[PDB]
Amino acid sequence: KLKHLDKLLAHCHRRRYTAKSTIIYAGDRCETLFFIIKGSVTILIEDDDGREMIIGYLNSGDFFGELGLFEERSAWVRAKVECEVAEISYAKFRELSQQDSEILYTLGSQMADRLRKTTRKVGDLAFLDVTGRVARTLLDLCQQPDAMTHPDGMQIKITRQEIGRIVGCSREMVGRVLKSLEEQGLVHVKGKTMVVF
């Protein structure tokens, strides 16, 4: 946020991506920074045999495509909802870093917060089994944007095949963790919407 956006996105190159649309492909070598005005994206990487895997989500006020500003695209960035995003060239960012140093702290603050979540992501895969990881992943998507409050808990918009690429198992084997958790009295599975108690 802050007042750095007015100086940064002064030369708007606003783009609108529909849901499911890919914005960044891994391996590309184009020097472009993105800022999310409204919407949410999905960050995807590959495992060891070339399957895609969800790492996290970025929301409004988030930058992405910024790891090349310092000395190839490291991940896929896909729009999960309708995203309003603006481009800034790496060249424009380099000049405005000299007109103000708070844009590198704004960018560094998001880079540091992504390290924390991703480092927590490494440990949650080592010290948790699949049942516990679908339990945490549900627990993490509440303290995450786009969940309204429910009388008995929270509502989240996620499919089981999305959870399988977050926790590292198949959607069918995840069918239980949602099934077994639903009959214990923690969760609701319905179409595109889950209720966590």
Ligand X SMILES: Nc1ncnc2c1ncn2[C@@H]1O[C@@H]2COP(=O)(O)O[C@H]2[C@H]1O
Is 109 a binding residue for ligand X by CB under 6 A? The answer is no
Q: Which does 73 bind (CB under 5 to 8 A by kind): ligand X, a copy of itself, Au ion, none?
A: ligand X
Q: Binding site annotation covers 119?
A: yes
**Rg for the chain (alpha carbons), in Å?**
18
CA 99 to mean position of chain CA atoms: 30
Residue 71, SS3 per DSSP: coil
- Per CB under 6 A, 68 contacts ligand X: yes
Which of 66, 135, 156, 158 is in the footprint of a copy of itself by CB under 8 A? 66
**Of positions 55, 86, 96, 186, contacts ligand X by CB under 6 A:** 55
Q: Which is nearer to a copy of itself, 80 or 114 (CB)?
A: 114
Q: Which of residues 154-193 bind ligand X (CB under 6 A)?
A: none
Site string for ligand X, 21-40 (x = CB under 6 A): ---x----------------
User: What does 109 bind: ligand X, a copy of itself, Au ion, none (CB cut-off 5 to 8 Å by kind)?
Assistant: a copy of itself
Q: Which residues are within 8 A (CB) of 160 and not within 5 positions of it... i.e. 6 or more apart?
A: 171, 174, 175, 178, 189
Query: How many CB atoms lie under 10 A from the CB of residue 152?
Result: 9
CA-CA distance, 121 to 126, in Å (whole number)? 9
Phi and psi at residue 65, to the nearest 5° = 70, 40
